[PDB]
Design a protein around this nucleic acid. Structure first.
Ligand SMILES: [Mg+2]
Ligand SMILES: [Mg+2]
Ligand SMILES: [Mg+2]
Ligand SMILES: [Mg+2]
Ligand SMILES: [Mg+2]
Ligand SMILES: [Mg+2]
Ligand SMILES: [Mg+2]
Ligand SMILES: [Mg+2]
Ligand SMILES: [Mg+2]
Ligand SMILES: [Mg+2]
Ligand SMILES: [Mg+2]
Ligand SMILES: [Mg+2]
Ligand SMILES: [Mg+2]
Ligand SMILES: [Mg+2]
Ligand SMILES: [Mg+2]
Ligand SMILES: [Mg+2]
Ligand SMILES: [Mg+2]
Ligand SMILES: [Mg+2]
Ligand SMILES: [Mg+2]
Ligand SMILES: [Mg+2]
Ligand SMILES: [Mg+2]
Ligand SMILES: [Mg+2]
Ligand SMILES: [Mg+2]
Ligand SMILES: [Mg+2]
Ligand SMILES: [Mg+2]
Ligand SMILES: [Mg+2]
Ligand SMILES: [Mg+2]
Ligand SMILES: [Mg+2]
Ligand SMILES: [Mg+2]
Ligand SMILES: [Mg+2]
Ligand SMILES: [Mg+2]
Ligand SMILES: [Mg+2]
Ligand SMILES: [Mg+2]
Ligand SMILES: [Mg+2]
Ligand SMILES: [Mg+2]
Ligand SMILES: [Mg+2]
Ligand SMILES: [Mg+2]
Ligand SMILES: [Mg+2]
Ligand SMILES: [Mg+2]
Ligand SMILES: [Mg+2]
Ligand SMILES: [Mg+2]
Ligand SMILES: [Mg+2]
Ligand SMILES: [Mg+2]
Ligand SMILES: [Mg+2]
Ligand SMILES: [Mg+2]
Lengths: 222, 156, 51, 148, 53, 185
RNA sequence: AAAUAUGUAAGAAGUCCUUGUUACUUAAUUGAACGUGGACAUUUGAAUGAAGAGCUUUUAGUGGGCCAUUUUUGGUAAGC
RNA sequence: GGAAUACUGCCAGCUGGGACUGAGGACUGCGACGUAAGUCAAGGAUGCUGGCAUAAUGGUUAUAUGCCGCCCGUCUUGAAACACGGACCAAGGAGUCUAACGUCUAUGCGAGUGUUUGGGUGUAAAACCCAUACGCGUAAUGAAAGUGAACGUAGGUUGGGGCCUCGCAAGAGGUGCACAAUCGACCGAUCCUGAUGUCUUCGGAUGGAUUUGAGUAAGAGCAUAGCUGUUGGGACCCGAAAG
RNA sequence: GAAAUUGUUGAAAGGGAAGGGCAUUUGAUCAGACA
């Protein structure tokens, strides 16, 4: 009987081909990320040269964390919370922005906090707290083979493929994002920076869209 | 019977431990602990005695001597976490120290090898101590926290 | 049995993401940016300091 | 048996399953069929439409067995021949020898038409036949012999 | 939308596919460059309290 | 706390083993769970659960209901499976041959199958002949022909048969059953 | 003439072609209804979610309620 | 003009002090470092040293100390209540049994089923055996006289597990029990039609109808037993004024 | 020959009740386990 080193070296070799593919991909993404990031920087500078104004395309991706406890919630916001999978306090998810999800975010503003996540906080959300849904069962993503197993259908064979398909709002974002179990964050470590959570951010509380400030919060909760 | 007895008994076969992965890597002492440095012993028999640091033994402990004829403290093992490394230092270039290892301290009154090793090491040190005045008396006197001493403040 | 956090476990960091090695070897978290000299037109500067 | 009864399970709970508010009293609805026209009427119509009032003729001293008329469909019929004798008769379906089935002797009073007997001729002696039952008997080349 | 989705179906497949006939919601808008040409920002401030009755 | 979107700790609601205590039925199950675990074959997974069903959900399949199913086009050489008892029907005069795998055959029913030169097989004999259930036709009896379902859904204008003991006129036929007394249902 | 609240629709139970049945209906093989035969697959027709969906039987307790924000009636008001 | 700096953000940059935890128990995975052989911090703690071998550690207990803690039972929107019962202790002390039943379940047998009124018999209130009947089921519908269930592969259509054929597979076609939806057919009632004939008033074929039935359309029952539920009974237990 | 309840003896606590929860000091008492 073979397979001793036989299909060991058929697999281990096949596993090198994939890590090869992943390495090759994650290198391109990094080029994508920073060239896209520099193009914007230089666009804001070119527009100021010509005397004009460059306006950033409004964000297509949003990260929502439920700020409010379980009880005394009116029914209509309470279902939206469920349909966004925030059923527990400090549990976040990603939501792609369209009018049809924008109205949802409107309904739940007093119970959540959300804003525009940076590549950094998405990377550090998935690496530390990312879990998949496989026959329900909430499996941790500790090896790229779990992801390819259930997301390979769409592309997406690596943990970073996931991360890419998320931040870019891919064609498959729905399947990519629903695959991720809702992130369960801890309470912030530096506290909330506010004396009362349940006013709006603008009002000196924590709720509603705080834009890029969602990162310092989420990082203290991750 | 008084009790029926089970339908199932545990296997009395005791299993094997999983193959653990913990390498024993070496202890890197803090930069303040360098041979020739004077130490303050914080605990044990010789607590509060000021003493000279010689060699770092394979069991992680430090090798010190008093010198014996100064403060009464012999060639001895001491734990690097019960000691205060001071700034004041003497050169150990003229002390041998190679002879001294863990086995040398196996339990297995004083053996004459020790009384002699104590004299060869201490004579080298005292040769050096006398170079810097009052260093000998410093080593003969015990350390104590006085009133108003704030360890988290004091330089050593 | 026990989840290991890639963000502090260099082993697990590398089991995912082989590109981590290249990244660190090439710095790349500190990548120094193209030094270019554009300056803003007067309009931008005038209306910025306007009232 | 009593040890499986749920009243063993209720021991220690104050109310025996009977509620603290509304208890277990003697006869809150009244007794028996009381109120079929008043407080219990919603249950009476729906679950018992037709309960109240009369219909039709009284018959004084009506003896059942005046009306005794057990009914047997062609659906069976042939079952009235023991199966050993039976199979012998199906093959050789004929006049000049055709099985005589006395249905009165079998405990039946009327032969109805449920359907489909094979084409074997039969002589069926009965007190009463449905019209279709007899037509079908004829279409197999048998007859009915009215008895009493 | 059915007889429209039938049109761009045939008129695409017979061309070699590339369809996209499901409806999408309002997307966030793209980036754009607004010119200052003939248009300089007109600076406004809050007005004081008046009465006029 | 979790805002619970569904009732927690809910049982599947489906029988898992038979509620029966019959060792042989337990053994038959033991067989077919194995078969259903290792065969990837639809027939075995279905047969497993049929063994769990109560006497109500195992209506008898008659020998004439069997004879019918073999008159389906291309069905005449298939072996019919009845997970449950099989009953005789004096109403068919010609029974085909076949091979019938059931839990039980009544005296009369097995006779009529064998008299025509058929075969009465126990379910385990059928597993050996057809592990993946090849060339099988499963028949279920008429579940809703119980006398009890007559009275289910009783109510106004439902046409549903009162729960009654003595019948005839004089029994629940007048007010509410006809336009001339009160109303009609 | 709002805001909030509310009915319906967002496909395979769909769409198009051909041309059968009738006692209804038409001036009329006209129509109406139900069809036989044929053409196009999942970017098959918005979003989000889905520890699945559907269904049947039987039976408990309950059938004094009270409170808060907002709307609001009677009362000067009320822990009415 | 040329720098610095703050502020905000990023680094898969390095590094120190402290705390809790150490689940698992051969191997199996994904990897990392090496020219290599090997090695590792990579699917959960090991190494080295010391002390006691004991009331040392631990359990129980009494007490002290910090913080906390109102009377139980009940009816109630609301009880610690300035609502009731209860001084204490033991021992009694309340959903039962029966008749007839609904849903469900187990079991026997199944178009049937039920030995136990009785008889036979007996190691004698048991066990074993049994003829005739009877009961319920196998026909329904009418107030009744009465009549009484296949146009047809026991129907058409739509969904339908399973199985069958083709295909490597994805798929496609074939057959389709249970069940569900829908249009029809059959029996009785009601209403209409009223042939052939006739003791000229009998007879009621035949074809129909927004009518109607607890029906037919390849039977599902009968019996024992159990929980729960129903009715009558002293009816879960104790309680009138009365008659 | 239980309990309520009582005498004696022994121990302990007690500034307008007592009793109770978590925790530890102290006293008393005790199991197991080393080899
Ligand atoms: Mg989401
Ligand atoms: Mg801080
Ligand atoms: Mg803090
Ligand atoms: Mg405050
Ligand atoms: Mg944290
Ligand atoms: Mg190792
Ligand atoms: Mg070190
Ligand atoms: Mg009972
Ligand atoms: Mg209970
Ligand atoms: Mg309770
Ligand atoms: Mg109850
Ligand atoms: Mg009570
Ligand atoms: Mg009440
Ligand atoms: Mg009556
Ligand atoms: Mg019946
Ligand atoms: Mg019936
Ligand atoms: Mg709406
Ligand atoms: Mg989903
Ligand atoms: Mg599911
Ligand atoms: Mg009720
Ligand atoms: Mg009620
Ligand atoms: Mg009322
Ligand atoms: Mg640290
Ligand atoms: Mg362990
Ligand atoms: Mg001890
Ligand atoms: Mg102790
Ligand atoms: Mg001991
Ligand atoms: Mg004491
Ligand atoms: Mg207190
Ligand atoms: Mg009150
Ligand atoms: Mg009071
Ligand atoms: Mg009272
Ligand atoms: Mg009292
Ligand atoms: Mg007692
Ligand atoms: Mg006797
Ligand atoms: Mg006998
Ligand atoms: Mg006799
Ligand atoms: Mg009868
Ligand atoms: Mg009759
Ligand atoms: Mg009296
Ligand atoms: Mg009186
Ligand atoms: Mg005595
Ligand atoms: Mg106590
Ligand atoms: Mg002992
Ligand atoms: Mg001991």
């Amino acid at each position: 009987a073979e397979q001793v080193a036989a299909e060991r070296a058929a697999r281990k070799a096949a596993n090198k081909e994939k890590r090869a593919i992943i390495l090759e991909r994650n290198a391109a993404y990094q080029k994508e990320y920073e060239t896209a990031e520099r193009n914007i920087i230089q666009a804001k500078r070119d527009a100021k040269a010509a005397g004009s104004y460059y306006v950033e395309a409004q964000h297509k991706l949003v990260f929502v964390v439920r700020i409010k406890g379980i009880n005394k919630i009116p029914p209509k916001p309470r279902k939206v919370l469920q349909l966004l999978r925030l059923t527990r306090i400090n549990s976040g998810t990603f939501v792609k922005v369209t009018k049809a999800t924008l109205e949802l975010l409107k309904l739940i503003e007093p119970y959540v906090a959300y804003g525009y996540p940076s590549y950094s906080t998405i990377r550090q959300l998935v690496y530390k707290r990312g879990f998949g849904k496989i026959n329900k069962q909430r499996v941790p993503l500790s090896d790229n083979a779990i992801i390819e197993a259930n997301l390979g259908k769409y592309g997406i064979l690596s943990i970073d493929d996931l991360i890419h398909e998320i931040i870019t709002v891919g064609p498959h974002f729905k399947q990519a994002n629903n695959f991720l179990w809702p992130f369960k964050l801890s309470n912030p470590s530096g506290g909330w920076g506010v004396p009362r959570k349940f006013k709006h951010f603008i009002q000196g509380g924590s709720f509603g869209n705080r834009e890029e400030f969602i990162n310092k919060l989420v990082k203290s909760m991750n | 019977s008084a009790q029926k007895a089970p339908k199932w008994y545990p296997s009395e076969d005791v299993a094997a431990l999983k193959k653990t992965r913990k390498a024993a890597r070496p202890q890197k002492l803090r930069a303040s602990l360098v041979p020739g440095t004077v130490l303050i012993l914080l605990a044990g028999r010789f607590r509060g005695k000021r003493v000279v640091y010689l060699k770092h033994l394979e069991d992680n402990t430090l090798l010190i001597s008093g010198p014996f004829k100064v403060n009464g403290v012999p060639l001895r093992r001491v734990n690097a976490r019960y000691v205060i490394a001071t700034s004041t230092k003497v050169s150990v270039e003229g002390v041998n120290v190679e002879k001294f290892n863990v086995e040398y301290f196996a339990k297995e009154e004083i053996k004459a090898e020790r009384v002699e090793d104590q004299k060869v090491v201490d004579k080298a040190l005292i040769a050096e101590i006398k170079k810097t005045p009052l260093l000998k008396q410093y080593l003969s006197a015990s350390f104590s926290l006085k009133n108003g001493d704030k360890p988290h403040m004091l330089k050593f | 049995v026990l989840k290991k956090n890639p963000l502090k476990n260099k082993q697990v960091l590398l089991r995912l993401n082989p590109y981590a090695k290249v990244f660190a070897a090439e710095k790349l978290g500190s990548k120094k940016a193209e030094k270019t000299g554009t300056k803003p037109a007067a309009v931008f500067t005038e209306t910025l300091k306007h009232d | 048996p009593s040890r499986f009864t749920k009243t063993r399970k209720h021991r220690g709970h104050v109310s025996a399953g009977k509620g603290r508010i509304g208890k277990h009293r003697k006869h809150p609805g009244g007794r028996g069929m009381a109120g079929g026209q008043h407080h219990h009427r919603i249950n009476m119509d729906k679950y018992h439409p037709g309960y109240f009032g009369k219909v039709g003729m009284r018959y004084f001293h009506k003896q059942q067995a005046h009306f005794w008329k057990p009914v047997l469909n062609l659906d069976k019929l042939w079952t009235l021949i023991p199966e050993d004798k039976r199979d012998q008769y199906l093959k050789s379906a004929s006049k000049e020898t055709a099985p005589v089935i006395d249905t009165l002797a079998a405990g039946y009073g009327k032969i109805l038409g449920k359907g489909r007997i094979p084409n074997v001729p039969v002589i069926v002696k009965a007190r009463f036949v449905s019209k279709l039952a007899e037509e079908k008997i004829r279409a197999a080349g048998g007859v009915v012999e009215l008895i009493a | 939308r059915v007889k429209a989705n039938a049109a761009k179906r045939a008129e695409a497949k017979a061309q070699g596919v590339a369809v996209q006939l499901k409806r999408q919601p309002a997307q966030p808008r793209e980036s754009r460059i607004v010119s200052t040409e003939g248009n300089v920002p007109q600076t406004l401030a809050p007005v004081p309290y008046e009465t006029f009755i | 706390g979790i805002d619970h979107t569904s009732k927690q700790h809910k049982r599947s609601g489906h029988r898992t083993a038979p509620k029966s205590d019959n060792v042989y039925l337990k053994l038959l199950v033991k067989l077919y769970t194995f078969l259903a675990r290792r065969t990837d074959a639809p027939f075995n997974k279905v047969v497993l659960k049929a063994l769990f069903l109560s006497k109500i959900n195992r209506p008898p399949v008659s020998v004439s209901r069997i004879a019918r199913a073999l008159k389906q086009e291309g069905a005449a050489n298939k072996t019919v499976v009845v997970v449950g008892t099989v009953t005789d029907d004096a109403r068919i005069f010609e029974f085909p041959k076949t091979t019938v795998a059931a839990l039980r055959f009544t005296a009369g029913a097995r006779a009529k199958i064998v008299k025509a030169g058929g075969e009465c097989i126990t379910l385990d004999q059928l597993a050996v002949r057809a592990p993946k259930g090849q060339n099988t036709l499963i028949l279920r009896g008429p579940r809703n022909s119980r006398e009890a379902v007559r009275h289910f859904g009783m109510g106004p204008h439902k046409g549903k048969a009162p729960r009654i003991l003595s019948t005839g006129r004089k029994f629940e036929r007048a007010r509410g059953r006809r336009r001339s007394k009160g109303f009609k249902v």
